[PDB]
């Protein structure tokens, strides 16, 4: 017998500024590292970039109206740092703030709760130029100044805040895999910047307590819960290493202010552990969040990986199902296909039970409320005659995940809300437009920009009915 | 490249008073619940009881000389509460204290560190008679009076103390399975007695901080780390349930003073959650131990268990392999044979890597030092002519477990010592005498005490060499 979703459950949907806004150089916006990076040839699919994206900066009023039509309880978006401080640390750009003000007012005028993400991977290029951005402790006070600017301006209207979105992704992709700005493949630098981002997170949560005392704040972690392949003890040990190295490495810092000891010792034995200054641990331990943000898409099954074995594997860029290969850390673990779940054509696991598991793991380990900040299915959508997009695949994925959330809530996990990814179709960081996540289809592809018109998918009306029946009808 | 065992590592061996001492009615000792229980017909194998056991009460000087020959760094034993307080809470039996004094003096005169266990399952019968022993809050102050009696008498000479030995066993065998005193099969009463024992534990740790400010104290948990059968999401979820319900339920209280939420809510949904009084959480949270004691023998693998599925299973007390059957909690999990490890004739899994996994889990979750208070192999031994016992099976088991301990130390786990179960052969609570654990064979069986003579097994000389080389030679 399931509990119902609490009466004030934030039924949400989410975006990211670079992925949706466009207007990349209007009203005084400075350059972000993604403005620069995406124009480098060969980085992104068929050269797609966020110059225009889906032009939400100009079309937000149409977008919020569709949200109100849908009946969204909440909308999560990120603020573009380079719209607010074109220099990163220089003078405030009033026009930048004014856009987010207009957006927030528009949201509230329709009874939609704003959830403001501070950082979704678009640090101003100037800070990378001036001092290497996340590799310098200077970004801690510059990021604080930016966050306090937003707290003072919108705190009276915004209850829910997310600090760093998927810090493990932009640190890892940006400094170990070289797929994100700054395009580095250096684990020593990766863990130095990661440590500085941890301090940045902690500093702004401390500021938030001062400036928005009645608000709620937390980081948002890209969580792939780990599985052992089987009950072979070496495979279970590989799972212990994988969950600690991939997940606790970040979530323990967010929740407890300390790195896990085994992973630290392994990094130390390699000279990879970050530099620590007096006052780091106290700051990290003094910044307890109100919730853990969770971006969830899939789980990961691992097995034993000998000292000889797998390192970086092949990511699935194409959509040809089966093209991924195992990634691992030699001596600790390597990934392996989970034979008991389906995958998308990008080899992403479809594992809605895995979300319940991950929600139970966070509650069991940290006793924190959880805000699900991202969950969605990316697939090709066909526009059929009569403005009909039948994305039954997307409905099927979202339904099973929402069902497992309800089971998690019945187990006792405190889930604050759920933000589907995404509200409209948007630009993928590297893969363009054809892998769509939206409830609302946007009329463009990789070649033709067309008119960017919004078209309600079938999933839009499915989810309209979910919010209407507070989840009782799925 | 492995870290060495630290220089003051406690290379130990262990026993329990009812299993070893005998002298059940000598020198003013009162009846314990096990004196009474084991003499009820059908409770124990061939009617074996602890009237004589292996008569360590009279033979402790010989046994300590053998420990010294082996070069034992530490000896862990339990104190028999009914020797000290014959009626549990009245006047002290000075002859009872005087035995443990002579024992501790004998250990110290041979340079062996005593590790005193306060409680190994033998509460005096008079407290069971007066108020039902662990089922009444009366036991909190009675157990405290007894603990403080020991702290004041021996605290000058005993640094390391264990409070409750395997609370999860004597509570669940005593109140859920009905296999131990008081022979109850009632889940509601089980969780009430369990909660009272948590309070008694915390209360004596509080007293210890006053009376033995330089000592180290912890409870000892019977730890079987859980494994999922495979990467099927329903089986990983059964693993999350199993590890929380069987393991976190006790260790979270010990380390954090808190029950885990999902397990609590499932018990509450069944009317089984314990009665909580004002001040309970305050006491439980304010009694941090210096270390987590760990009794480890095996891991347990689990799979999905439907709501109509498995409950109590068949236990193996005969010694014929393949007799055990699945046990579980309907709707949460059930056990299943791990196909990737061997088992003993009593169906206990042989999983030395599981010990590394369990030590890693404790350090990862609680960041506590660990004292391994029990680990060993129970098997039939053959006394061959010339008083020779070749127990290579025991050496093989201890060697691989000690090997995995070193890997855990190298990972960063703070292991304070290792107490092999057991120093001499002793009485098994239910299984009689033939399932032997000792380094030292004792010449007796289930039908005759014979001459109770002590005979060093082959594993005696193996462990002697382990200690002489501080574990460099295994
Ligand atoms: O590469 P894909 O399939 O388009 O997935 C990208 C999505 O994956 C998530 O990791 C990001 O938080 C989103 O910003 C992004 O939209
Ligand atoms: O294998 P057996 O004979 O059932 O014994 C298990 C042993 O290990 C633990 O369960 C107990 O702490 C010991 O007291 C007991 O001797």
């Amino acid at each position: 017998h399931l509990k119902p979703f609490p009466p004030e459950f934030l039924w949400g949907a989410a975006s990211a500024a670079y992925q949706v806004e466009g207007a990349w150089n209007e009203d005084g916006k400075g350059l972000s590292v993604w403005d620069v990076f995406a124009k480098q040839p060969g980085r992104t699919f068929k050269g797609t970039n966020g110059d225009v994206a889906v032009d939400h900066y100009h079309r937000y009023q149409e977008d919020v109206a569709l949200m109100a039509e849908m009946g969204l309880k909440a909308y999560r978006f990120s603020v573009s740092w380079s719209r607010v401080f074109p220099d990163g640390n220089g003078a405030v750009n009033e026009k930048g703030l004014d856009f987010y003000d207009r957006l927030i007012e528009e949201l509230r005028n329709h009874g939609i709760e704003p959830i403001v993400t501070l950082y979704h991977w678009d640090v101003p290029q100037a800070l990378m130029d001036a001092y290497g951005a996340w590799e310098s402790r200077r970004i801690i006070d510059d990021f604080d100044r930016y966050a306090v600017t937003l707290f003072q301006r919108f705190g009276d209207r915004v209850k829910y805040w997310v600090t760093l979105n998927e810090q493990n992704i932009f640190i890892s992709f940006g400094y170990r895999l070289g797929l994100h700005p700054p395009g580095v493949k250096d684990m020593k630098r990766m863990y130095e910047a990661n440590h500085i981002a941890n301090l940045a997170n902690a500093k702004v949560i401390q500021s938030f307590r001062h400036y928005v005392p009645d608000g709620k704040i937390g980081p948002s972690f890209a969580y792939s819960p780990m599985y052992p392949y089987d009950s072979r003890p070496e495979n279970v040990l590989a799972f212990e290493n994988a969950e600690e190295f991939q997940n606790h490495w970040w979530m323990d810092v967010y929740a407890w202010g300390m790195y896990p000891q085994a992973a630290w010792n392994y990094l130390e034995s390699q000279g990879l552990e970050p530099t620590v200054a007096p006052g780091d641990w106290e700051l990290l331990q003094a910044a307890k969040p109100d919730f853990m943000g969770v971006n969830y898409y899939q789980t990961t099954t691992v097995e034993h990986n000998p000292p000889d074995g797998v390192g970086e594997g092949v990511m699935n860029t194409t959509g040809k199902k089966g093209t991924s290969t195992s990634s691992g850390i030699p001596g600790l673990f390597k990934t392996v296909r989970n034979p008991h779940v389906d995958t998308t054509n990008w080899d992403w696991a479809i594992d809605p039970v895995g979300l319940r598991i991950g929600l139970r793991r966070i509650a069991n380990r940290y006793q924190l409320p959880i805000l699900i900040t991202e969950n969605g299915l990316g697939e090709f959508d066909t526009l059929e005659p009569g403005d009909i997009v039948n994305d039954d695949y997307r409905i099927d994925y979202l339904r099973r995940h929402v069902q497992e959330i309800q089971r998690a809530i019945t187990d006792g996990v405190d889930v604050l809300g759920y933000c589907a990814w995404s509200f409209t179709d948007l630009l993928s960081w590297l893969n363009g437009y054809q892998k769509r996540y939206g409830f609302v289809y946007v009329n463009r592809d990789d070649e033709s920009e067309k008119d960017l018109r919004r078209i309600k998918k079938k999933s839009f009306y499915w989810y309209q009915r979910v919010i209407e029946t507070n989840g009782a009808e799925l």
Side-chain angles (χ1 to χ4, degrees), chain A residues 1-94 96-474:
Chain A
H1 178 91
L2 294 324
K3 285 195 182 308
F5 291 87
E8 303 295 70
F9 191 74
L10 301 172
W11 292 101
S15 70
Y18 171 89
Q19 282 183 286
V20 104
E21 280 183 4
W24 75 282
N25 70 348
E26 301 193 12
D27 301 334
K29 185 187 163 300
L31 280 174
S32 84
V33 295
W34 268 95
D35 287 318
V36 178
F37 189 84
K39 281 151 183 173
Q40 309 186 343
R43 293 288 196 189
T44 74
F45 184 57
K46 314 237 272 189
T48 52
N49 63 43
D51 285 347
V52 180
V54 297
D55 191 35
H56 170 90
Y57 185 90
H58 292 113
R59 310 175 59 125
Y60 69 99
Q61 287 175 307
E62 183 197 3
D63 282 348
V64 174
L66 285 149
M67 295 173 203
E69 182 177 348
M70 179 178 255
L72 273 191
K73 305 299 187 177
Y75 171 66
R76 184 178 67 86
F77 61 94
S78 81
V79 173
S80 179
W81 190 350
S82 77
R83 279 193 203 284
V84 176
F85 287 90
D87 292 6
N89 57 9
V92 186
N93 185 274
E94 277 300 324
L97 284 178
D98 179 81
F99 164 73
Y100 292 109
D101 209 315
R102 281 181 285 116
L103 169 67
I104 285 157
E105 284 309 307
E106 204 66 12
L107 288 171
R108 314 240 323 183
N109 291 334
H110 294 79
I112 300 176
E113 274 289 343
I115 302 164
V116 167
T117 308
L118 292 188
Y119 188 75
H120 197 139
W121 308 353
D122 51 354
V123 56
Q125 180 65 56
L127 297 184
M128 176 67 64
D129 292 348
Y131 53 69
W134 290 104
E135 297 182 85
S136 154
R137 291 176 172 258
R138 296 169 54 168
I139 201 170
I140 297 170
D141 290 325
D142 292 341
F143 184 60
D144 196 40
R145 184 164 172 254
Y146 159 64
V148 168
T149 298
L150 302 180
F151 295 157
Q152 293 176 303
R153 176 67 167 263
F154 306 117
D156 319 76
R157 281 165 288 171
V158 178
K159 178 177 186 172
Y160 294 97
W161 294 73
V162 167
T163 50
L164 303 186
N165 200 17
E166 307 182 308
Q167 171 185 341
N168 52 314
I169 294 299
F170 82 79
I171 287 299
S172 196
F173 278 52
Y175 296 91
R176 178 172 42 194
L177 300 168
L179 304 180
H180 288 16
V184 164
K185 294 186 207 181
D186 187 326
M187 287 195 280
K188 173 65 186 149
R189 302 171 62 179
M190 201 222 78
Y191 285 105
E192 297 288 7
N194 188 61
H195 182 72
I196 292 166
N198 286 335
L199 301 168
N201 177 69
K203 186 83 185 52
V204 303
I205 291 162
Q206 254 182 355
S207 297
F208 184 83
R209 300 321 185 180
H210 182 293
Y211 290 96
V212 195
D214 295 307
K216 299 196 153 10
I217 192 172
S220 185
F221 178 64
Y223 191 14
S224 192
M226 305 283 142
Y227 295 171
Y229 187 71
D230 56 21
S231 58
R232 188 183 295 272
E234 295 70 17
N235 284 341
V236 181
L237 176 61
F239 146 79
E240 302 296 328
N241 290 315
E243 185 80 349
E244 190 184 287
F245 204 90
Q246 304 296 94
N247 292 318
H248 298 165
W249 184 257
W250 282 271
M251 280 193 296
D252 288 9
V253 170
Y254 293 155
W256 295 339
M258 53 182 60
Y259 295 106
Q261 188 64 62
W264 182 273
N265 285 14
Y266 170 81
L267 298 181
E268 222 188 277
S269 78
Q270 318 266 318
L272 296 172
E273 94 283 1
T275 308
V276 184
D280 284 4
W281 300 135
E282 307 91 308
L283 176 60
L284 291 177
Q285 284 155 216
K288 300 247 169 307
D290 304 278
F291 62 80
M292 184 75 74
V294 167
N295 320 47
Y296 175 81
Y297 292 90
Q298 58 175 322
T299 55
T300 301
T301 300
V302 303
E303 64 187 343
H304 156 85
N305 190 27
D308 305 6
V310 163
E312 316 187 340
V314 174
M315 305 207 328
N316 185 313
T317 88
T318 52
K320 222 180 67 145
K321 169 182 208 129
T323 46
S324 280
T325 55
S326 157
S327 192
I329 305 175
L332 304 191
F333 64 87
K334 67 184 181 198
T335 68
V336 58
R337 197 160 62 262
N338 182 345
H340 304 292
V341 289
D342 286 324
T343 61
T344 77
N345 293 95
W346 286 248
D347 305 326
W348 293 27
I350 300 165
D351 189 355
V353 174
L355 173 57
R356 181 183 181 192
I357 292 168
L359 294 177
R360 291 273 308 270
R361 278 182 192 174
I362 285 173
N364 163 279
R365 191 175 168 84
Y366 311 115
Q367 310 79 46
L368 285 165
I370 297 156
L371 175 62
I372 301 192
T373 51
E374 270 186 43
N375 179 245
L377 174 76
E379 181 61 306
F380 302 111
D381 294 327
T382 294
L383 184 59
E384 292 173 51
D387 277 23
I388 294 174
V389 183
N390 286 321
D391 55 338
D392 290 316
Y393 38 91
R394 179 166 297 105
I395 296 176
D396 186 59
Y397 177 103
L398 295 170
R399 179 198 284 113
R400 290 158 65 196
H401 282 76
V402 173
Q403 280 168 347
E404 297 295 326
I405 300 172
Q406 201 184 3
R407 286 168 184 136
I409 297 173
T410 307
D411 294 347
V413 180
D414 185 9
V415 182
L416 302 189
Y418 171 77
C419 295
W421 183 268
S422 57
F423 181 71
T424 68
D425 293 341
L426 43 70
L427 169 69
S428 153
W429 300 93
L430 312 166
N431 304 134
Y433 295 91
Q434 291 310 136
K435 194 181 173 191
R436 303 173 188 268
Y437 285 82
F439 293 125
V440 177
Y441 181 99
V442 170
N443 196 25
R444 78 149 293 168
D445 63 31
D446 296 323
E447 324 278 20
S448 320
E449 265 166 277
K450 307 172 180 178
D451 58 358
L452 309 175
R453 67 184 188 99
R454 278 62 165 142
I455 302 182
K456 287 169 284 165
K457 308 190 199 177
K458 192 173 181 178
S459 51
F460 179 101
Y461 296 109
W462 177 80
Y463 196 56
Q464 186 177 50
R465 187 94 91 220
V466 174
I467 307 190
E468 180 176 58
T469 68
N470 201 29
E473 192 178 347
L474 303 179

